[PDB]
């Protein structure tokens, strides 16, 4: 600011973290908010309720707990990880006693087939009553994770050094990029059996 008439935006608006116009519309419902947030290497899902003096989180889930606990050695910034996290948070909400929520994707755009909508699909499959329309979900093959395996196979067919550059972390970790759908199915079965 350089003058008395300058209008300094809210702290969160300056930090570029909140869209208050959408936040007001979300809060007008008066229902728990299923907040989904994305990062380069992780995903975050929380369920929050409103307090006039500060929001309170009831149940929170992360992807860092998927590597441990159930066991998920894949990259935590992709659609299968998002789906697993959605299942986990949905089951946690059912355990906590909340069955319906309202999705909150923050500043992310509403693009079809995104990881946020993968999380929404995972929560719905878990059992949470989150309003939605099926047309927005990612395709079943992408949800399972085939596209990654197809890309890995294409890279292997093409120059192998490029394939190693693309999937270097999986090689050192000990997982072949192919069979990742099988790994994801095993993880999903583990989670379902644990929570049922």
């Amino acid at each position: 600011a350089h003058g008395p008439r300058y209008r300094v935006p809210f702290r969160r608006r300056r930090e570029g973290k909140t869209n208050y116009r959408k936040r007001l519309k979300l809060l007008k419902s008066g229902k728990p908010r299923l907040v989904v947030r994305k990062s380069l290497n992780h995903h975050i899902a929380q369920i929050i309720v409103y307090d006039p003096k500060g929001d309170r989180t009831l149940v929170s889930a992360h992807t860092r707990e998927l590597i441990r606990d159930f066991g998920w050695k894949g990259h935590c910034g992709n659609t299968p990880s998002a789906y697993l996290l959605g299942l986990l948070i949905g089951y946690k909400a059912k355990q906590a006693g909340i069955e319906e929520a309202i999705l909150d994707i923050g500043l992310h755009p509403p693009v079809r087939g995104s990881s946020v909508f993968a999380v929404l699909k995972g929560a719905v499959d878990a059992g949470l009553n989150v309003p939605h329309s099926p047309e927005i979900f990612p395709d079943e093959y992408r949800i399972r994770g085939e596209h990654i395996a197809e890309y890995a196979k294409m890279l292997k067919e093409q120059d192998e050094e490029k394939f190693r550059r693309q999937f270097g972390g999986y090689l050192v970790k000990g997982l072949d990029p192919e069979k990742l759908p099988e790994h994801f199915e095993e993880v999903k079965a583990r989670i379902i059996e644990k929570f049922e």
């Binding site: 930090e15 570029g16 973290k17 500043l107 992310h108």
Partner: protein
């Protein structure tokens, strides 16, 4: 450039401080809507590979014979290895010297090409005279995405902002020489 060796030492010490080309823009000020504009369009398509953008007229000016909403000029923007190769080609087609009084305060180069070289082709089926362009290459540092991304947007401090001497040094090291415009 008295600070050439200091800038090179800083660059080698901190690789993330090495300037890089952000984008190279080719503009054609046709100043008219018609077969000449279409000629500029097709020539740019052949030169680059990607289709161009027609620019409309802001306000009206009977002196230049323009009308609001009428396409006037043509624009194209290139980035990446294509930008590298095409920039090399245009800088070779034009004489290999950039005048000192062309770098702005942020180390961006803006020159013009009036003659056709480097596999130009002398086809004159279209207007033909539509040739002639202004080339503007912008420089950046790798961590400039902050000021352009939507979420968690911030500002780039003067420490990371570029400048004239650094832009000149990078241009010289990459390719080309500078002249003192007499």
């Amino acid at each position: 450039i008295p600070n050439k060796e200091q800038i090179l030492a800083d660059w080698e010490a901190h690789p993330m401080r090495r300037p890089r080309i952000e984008k190279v823009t080719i503009n054609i000020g046709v100043g008219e809507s018609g077969e000449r504009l279409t000629k500029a369009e097709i020539m740019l398509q052949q030169l680059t590979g990607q289709k161009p953008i027609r620019r409309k007229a802001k306000k009206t000016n009977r002196d230049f014979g323009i009308r609001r909403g009428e396409p006037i000029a043509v624009k194209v923007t290139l980035r990446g290895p294509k930008a590298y190769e095409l920039l090399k080609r245009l800088l070779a087609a034009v004489d290999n010297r950039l005048k000192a009084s062309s770098f702005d305060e942020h180390g961006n180069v803006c020159f013009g090409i009036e003659e056709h070289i480097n596999i130009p082709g002398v086809e004159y089926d279209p207007e033909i005279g539509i040739f002639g362009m202004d080339v503007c290459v912008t420089l950046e540092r790798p961590g400039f995405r902050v000021a352009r991304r939507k979420r968690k947007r911030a500002k780039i401090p003067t420490r990371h902002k570029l400048t004239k001497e650094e832009g000149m040094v990078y241009m010289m090291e990459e390719f080309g020489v500078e002249i003192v415009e007499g």
